[PDB]
Each structure stands twice: as structure tokens, then as C-alpha cells.
Amino acid sequence: MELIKGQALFLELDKKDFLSLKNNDKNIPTFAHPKNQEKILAIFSLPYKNPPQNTKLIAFYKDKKEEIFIKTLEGNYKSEKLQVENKKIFPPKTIQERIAKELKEANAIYSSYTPKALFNGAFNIPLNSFITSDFGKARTFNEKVASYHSGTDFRAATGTPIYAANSGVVKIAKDRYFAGNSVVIDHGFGIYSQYYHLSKIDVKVGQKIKKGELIGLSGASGRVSGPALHFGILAGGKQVDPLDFVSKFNAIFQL
């Protein structure tokens, strides 16, 4: 199989006698195929930055093992050359501390795996607008990726209502350094949606939210370039191309 860096893949496996799916010594969770009772599904994602060139997963059954080989593709992302090397930068200590704290917090949240669906059918876009800055635009130095856009931005004037892309539970609902005012929803199965730069947060941590329910108003908080909604999906432990992910997910779960 082949998969573009920065994307998720829904792997389909026989259910009967299945024991475990492994990537070296890391276990990858599974969940039911909603249509085919003889199958299960796993999400496998490649990171945008520094992905392996190749991956081998093994599905262990009671009677045998199944190898699955996935070749990393570079895809056709937009990229621009950096003029100055992305060397160590020197933020104020107060900012270093905040960043480190929020990273620890988020790493913890993304680690607390929910082994059931909290979604309700297909994902919907969070507002009926258009993309102004796509996922995966990159900046390179010496042809190596230095940084990339980890979500997709939708055009929005400040104060535009934003709606949950699917049902779930709110895990994050505060102001953060990279993200500004942000909401993160757990949808189950290690799938999280992210809504950044809000001017107003309308939910709280722990709240059950329905698909299409208001979560906030769009803004420019924490944004250098002007008001817009930054939308992200984390799945399989990695930030992945959100519209690509929704397309894949909806192909399986929309009915």
C-alpha cells in the first residue's frame, strides 16, 4: 500500500481470531467495521515531518500473522524555500514555559484513548465557507521540511458561528499560545477535531456536544495573518489532512 505523508489510512482486517495489530512494539487499536461484520478497522497515519520511508504493520491472529506494508509518498504539497535556516529561536522564558506546559497538557489528552464511537455518522464542515490556506503547505531549508501548516484555514470574518464537525466530548476549551482561543473535541477512536483562533468559546471542558451544535465564534486570536478558522484533525496520533480524513471517514460511516 502507499500513503502520502500527513494523511490517515483506514486499514481493514478480518475480525475472526484477531489478537493484535502492531507497529514494532507499539499497539494500534481497532474498531468495528460498521457495514461488514466480518471486518475490523484501524487508523494508521504518517507524520508530515520526518516520516519513515516504509512501514510494516503486523496483524497477529490466533493461527497466523499478516504483514501490511505501507510506502510513504511525498505527495504534491505547496512548498517554499526558507532564506534563513530554522535554527533555535529564543523566546522569553515565560513563553517557553507556557508552550511546554500546554504541550504536556495536550499530549496527555491525546493519550487518553476512547474505545467507542462518540460521533454520529458523517463529519460536516464546521462552517459553510471556503479554504484560504490548505493543509501541508510547507517551508523548506535545504530541501528538508522546517515547518508546515498542520490544519486547514476557512475564510471567516470575526464573529462567524462555528459548529462542531461531529458529536463528541470537549477536551480543550481555553486560550493557548499557538492556537489562541481553542476547542478540541474527542470523537472516539483517537479522532480529535480542533477549532483554533476563536473570538468566543461557547463550550466547556467535559461537555457532550452534538454534530452541528455551536462551539464558538471565529476570530483572530493568536493569529498573525488576520481572522480565519483554523480546523485540524488528529487521528492515529498525528495531525493529518482534515478534508482528506473527512472524505475517508465519511466513505465508511456516512450511512
Ligand SMILES: CC(=O)N[C@@H](CCN(CC(=O)O)Cc1ccccc1)C(=O)N[C@H](C)C(=O)NO
Ligand atoms: C509553531 C507555530 O508557530 N504555529 C503557528 C504558525 C505556522 N505553522 C506551524 C505549525 O505546524 O503549528 C507553520 C506553517 C504555516 C503555513 C505554511 C508553512 C508553515 C500557528 O499559528 N499555528 C496554527 C495551528 C495555524 O496554523 N493557524 O493558521
Ligand SMILES: [Zn+2]
Ligand atoms: Zn491554520
